[PDB]
Amino acid sequence: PQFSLWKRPVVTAYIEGQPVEVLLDTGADDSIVAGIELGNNYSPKIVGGIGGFINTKEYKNVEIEVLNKKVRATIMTGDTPINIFGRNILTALGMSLNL
Amino acid sequence: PQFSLWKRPVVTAYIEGQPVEVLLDTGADDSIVAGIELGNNYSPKIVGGIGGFINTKEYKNVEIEVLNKKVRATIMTGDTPINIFGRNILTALGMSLNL
Numbered sequence: 001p002q003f004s005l006w007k008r009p010v011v012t013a014y015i016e017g018q019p020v021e022v023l024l025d026t027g028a029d030d031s032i033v034a035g036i037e038l039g040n041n042y043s044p045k046i047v048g049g050i051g052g053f054i055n056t057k058e059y060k061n062v063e064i065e066v067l068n069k070k071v072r073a074t075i076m077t078g079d080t081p082i083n084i085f086g087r088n089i090l091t092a093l094g095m096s097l098n099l
Numbered sequence: 100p101q102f103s104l105w106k107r108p109v110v111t112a113y114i115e116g117q118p119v120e121v122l123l124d125t126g127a128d129d130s131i132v133a134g135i136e137l138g139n140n141y142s143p144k145i146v147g148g149i150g151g152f153i154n155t156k157e158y159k160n161v162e163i164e165v166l167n168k169k170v171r172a173t174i175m176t177g178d179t180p181i182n183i184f185g186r187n188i189l190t191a192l193g194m195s196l197n198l
């Protein structure tokens with residue numbers, strides 16, 4: 001699949017079965033999602049962006065189904081306006097940015 | 100050429116002749132650079148990301164050179180920790196995200 005970038009590269013992903021719309025983001029080191037419950041196996045983490053920092057709960061080894069691929073990766077939950085799938089997930093998928 | 104994403108996709112871009120390191124960012128709608136004084140013909144804007152909003156100054160038709168490609172694009176200056184080339188510049192360069 002090729003994303004031309006004329007529109008936001010958004011797809012539907014399944015995180016432990018829960019469907020979520022995420023943005024494929026090359027400018028994010030991590031993945032952060034809002035609105036899903038993942039349980040008690042987390043450590044609190046601080047993540048910084050353009051307007052400042054935010055607290056998140058970091059879950060490691062979460063099962064993710066996206067673009068017909070299945071991967072286990074770290075996911076953070078927190079107050080984000082858009083669900084982000086950063087490089088930790090993009091590299092696992094084998095996705096690249098081409099010029 | 101391709102960016103495999105194991106590392107942040109960073110390049111040296113020349114903006115109106117000045118070299119600057121920028122992050123190629125598919126999760127960004129706009130481009131925001133710090134430390135470039137382009138004059139007073141800009142439009143005041145506000146851009147939001149993780150953590151909140153920042154005030155930016157938008158300039159149109161700015162000369163940008165990346166890996167020997169030259170385009171004129173819209174660019175914003177503002178207090179950003181990292182310089183970002185968002186989708187408006189990535190499309191102008193013909194970049195795409197592939198799997």
Ligand SMILES: CC(=O)N[C@H](C(=O)N[C@@H](Cc1ccccc1)[C@@H](O)CN(CC1CCCCC1)NC(=O)[C@@H](NC(C)=O)C(C)C)C(C)C
Pocket residue numbers: 025027028029030031032047048049050080081082084086124125126127128129130131146147148149179180181183185
């Ligand atoms: C609306 C929009 O496109 N905002 C962009 C933006 O903040 N994009 C974020 C993801 C995003 C978009 C919209 C709403 C909320 C979040 C992302 O693509 C770019 N930023 C770049 C950061 C990098 C660290 C220094 C400051 C700039 N990435 C992040 O915020 C991520 N942080 C890190 C460290 O990777 C975070 C999502 C995990 C601006 C750069 C123009």
